[PDB]
Assembly symmetry: D2
Homo-oligomer: 209 residues x 4
């Protein structure tokens, strides 16, 4: 009984792995099982009482032998892995009614992962006009092209009213346009490299075209 509580507590915390089979347990049957095994430290008084005994597993509330629509996890059902379901099946049997087996599937996602940034990127900076003049600054990998350019303008004394564009300079007149403003220094492929800032001429033409 206390073993039963410890078993299902750890089995509910099983890691989801693609292709694994999990089982839907009606939250009505499960709420009774909890009280009966003293699962919650704030609800131990009915532990072992034949009144809170859940009986054989009953998922009739969840079925129409097709499953009902709009069911929510935790509110209407509980998910247990094979081991967990077989243990509840051993201990209580199932109502005279088939099991509710569903598979773990993967969904691709774009997320945000945090990390402590120990090392900042040291980049070389110059203006197209006077490239002999090189300034070195350290930048966070999470900084966007937009943010890096504003900073380079502060360094090279460029008024916010003058239009600009940034380049990544290579050997022998090779210049990569950095025209994806929301990309991070990391996603733009800038490693520990020479940047070139360019001002739009008064007439509205560009010194590089």
């Amino acid at each position: 009984l206390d073993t039963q509580r410890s078993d299902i507590a750890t089995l509910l915390k099983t890691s989801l792995r693609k292709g694994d089979t999990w089982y839907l347990v009606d939250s009505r049957w499960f709420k009774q099982w909890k009280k009966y095994v003293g699962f919650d430290s704030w609800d131990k008084y009915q532990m072992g009482d034949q009144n809170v005994y859940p009986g054989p597993i009953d998922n009739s509330g969840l079925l129409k032998q097709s499953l009902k629509e709009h069911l929510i996890d935790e509110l209407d059902y509980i998910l247990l892995p094979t081991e967990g379901w077989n243990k509840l099946v051993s201990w209580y049997t199932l109502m005279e009614q088939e099991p509710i087996a569903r598979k773990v599937v993967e969904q691709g996602m774009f997320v945000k992962h945090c990390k402590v940034e120990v090392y900042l990127t040291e980049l070389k900076l110059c203006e197209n006009g006077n490239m002999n003049n090189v300034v070195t600054r350290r930048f966070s990998k999470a900084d966007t092209i937009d943010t890096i350019e504003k900073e380079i303008r502060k360094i090279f004394s460029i008024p916010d009213e003058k239009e600009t564009r940034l380049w990544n300079k290579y050997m022998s007149n090779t210049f990569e346009p950095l025209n994806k403003p929301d990309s991070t220094i990391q996603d733009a492929g800038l490693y520990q490299q020479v940047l070139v800032i360019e001002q739009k001429n008064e007439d509205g033409t560009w010194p590089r075209g």
Copy 2:
């Protein structure tokens, strides 16, 4: 001392949040602090001994007052949040040497998230030739267009040697091409919809062009 062990144990498990400041603690100084406070249940014998006393925080091993390159977390240093660092600073002071403060930054990522698939997608299926004949099947949201097409070919008796292509049929002769084979039924925008399968003519032309 046992409070100290419990404090830093929970503070090492602090959640990373963008903009938060964390601190680098030399793993040499930290390994001594651990022994001295009996942090590990397998190493409690030197707890309180003036021999294992770590002294004021020393990060001289990590510094060159610039940080050394190629340092790895856990191997060379430990990360603690502000609270954790201020507590170690209170309890031990810092060597006569400035603190090593670094920021939490976010990095965009494509990942895989698991979920139990409770509901499968019911789709309508037909061949371009005879559209009067409609078959209904349930599919996993993780199935690719490639997998769905192979299954539809099995249903409509299409030999693997005959070339095909799949459509998503709308009202009044509107047909969407499903030519992204590795996309999931979910990413391809197929909800609870009529599919149309098309066979390439013997001559090498397509019945729809």
Copy 3:
């Protein structure tokens, strides 16, 4: 009109950022807007026709001025950011009916991220019995303690019928138990370190207890 198509196509692909306001557009109104602007290359024939003109934005299908329950993205509504909504509001106005504004929120998640493993971890291995005998092997950071132990047993000629346990050996008789079998070499804190394997005595006692 073609500008309108290009604008909303890029604006639908806006990155979700916490605190941003997005707008619900009835998929009925949006399906008409699409046909009218020739959004899909397979449906351009009604482009500009006063028959497919969507009129002022109408979300009456989605409202009960409270929102209807069980609505699904793409099936019942489309999500556009502020810019996107203001552009549709500029171009078409809204029906005489308030906008449907909702916020971007973050949810914590355990996911799986892929990476090419360029460097494998070199670990030192020995048996408790004869520690003078040290073997060095390279392991993937994704290998579990369970997998590493089975391999160490193969190396030290240990039959699968004999029970075992693995240790992480430090200086001066300090031994860390590696009793979290599903943890990866990485999550268990094992870096480029001496492992100790231990066999359970015939009598059922342990050489280390």
Copy 4:
């Protein structure tokens, strides 16, 4: 040659899947291949020139036949899948020197995923003192217990100087403690439920103990 550019451009964008084999290409050899095939629209002038011809694949820069340590992706090497590597091997051969094959591995991670919150959670609220008085409010699933409690205090006119604690009330005197302050309403298991707020008595005891 232009086919070659299009092939490797798409193959570099291959999705990482566990167990797949990828190949390390020295960024020196790859930078030359790029110029020669006119990979970058800002560097097409040397396209086809026997001067920028990369020759057979050479990874001697990356090898010591063991791989050099501290190598960074993009800076020192490029990663290509099997197809990509076999195509470069077909087109250029390999230097007389073995290939550098590495595997895709998964790492478990805690991340943050964004979603537009269409539906907020409607919760029932009351004070322990007078439970006959019930107030209903809608909350974001991302709100923490800490935030929800501060709001409930504003509703029930509780000064910030008076200490409190929150409960989740069930049927027949069952009260769950909500003592994980940083947990979200979602992670705390609160669905569309009765909350009970409790004030600490002047003497320092609790009305519920």
